[PDB]
Write a protein that binds this ligand. Structure first.
Ligand SMILES: Cc1cc2nc3c(=O)[nH]c(=O)nc-3n(C[C@H](O)[C@H](O)[C@H](O)COP(=O)(O)O)c2cc1C
Length: 191
């Protein structure tokens, strides 16, 4: 588990995981404490496994199916799917799954975040984004969609350092500690 992997998720209070698509079946390579407190699954019993172990009998296949669609298109997707905790108790999981890049902006990975639940988080995220300047929104929209800093820059007619500066600016504006969290807020708002 690279340092950045754990920097990215362990800093988030929301149940979060990271998978590696260059491993067969795109298994998880890390989870944070909140995931364990949500599901009851310890990391030893998650890492190396595809996150489908949260799926069960009532899991609506059409929702599972847009997740796999978002994974293969490399696009963020957010659904409220029926999952099952460790004790077997079913729960409504507002699950985000989004393409994310490592520290070197080289390799693609997948970030998942899970919250037990709705439109309230949506309205919330919308209020947070409303405090950002027009340019910070541009940057936020583009990062959330998966792109690299290099790529976001290319789309705004910017340098990679300027974008970095802007991100740091939104991270402190929104009082966030990890990018995982910013991603989820953008997708929640539809931005
Ligand atoms: C990072 C990540 C997190 C995921 N989290 C969940 C989840 O919390 N709940 C869920 O039902 N599926 C989640 N998925 C997708 C499941 O693995 C999905 O059921 C599986 O990819 C489809 O299995 P199949 O198409 O081989 O039948 C996640 C996928 C990724 C990449």
């Amino acid at each position: 588990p690279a340092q950045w992997v754990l920097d990215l998720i362990e800093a988030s209070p929301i149940a979060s995981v990271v998978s590696d698509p260059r491993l067969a079946d795109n298994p998880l390579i890390a989870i944070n404490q909140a995931f364990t407190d949500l599901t009851g699954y310890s990391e030893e019993e998650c890492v190396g496994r595809n996150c489908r172990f949260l799926a069960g009998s009532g899991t609506e296949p059409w929702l599972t199916d847009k997740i796999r669609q978002g994974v293969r298109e490399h696009k963020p997707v957010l659904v409220e799917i029926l999952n099952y905790k460790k004790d077997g108790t079913p729960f409504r999981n507002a699950v985000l799954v989004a393409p994310i890049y490592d520290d070197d902006d080289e390799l693609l990975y997948f970030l998942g975040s899970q919250v037990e639940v709705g439109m309230a988080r949506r309205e919330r995220a919308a209020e947070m984004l409303k405090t950002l300047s027009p340019r910070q929104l541009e940057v936020t929209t583009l990062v959330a969609s998966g792109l690299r800093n290099k790529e976001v820059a290319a789309r705004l007619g910017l340098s990679e350092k300027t974008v970095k500066m802007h991100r740091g600016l939104v991270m402190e504006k929104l009082n966030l500690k990890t990018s995982a969290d910013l991603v989820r807020i953008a997708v929640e708002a539809g931005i």
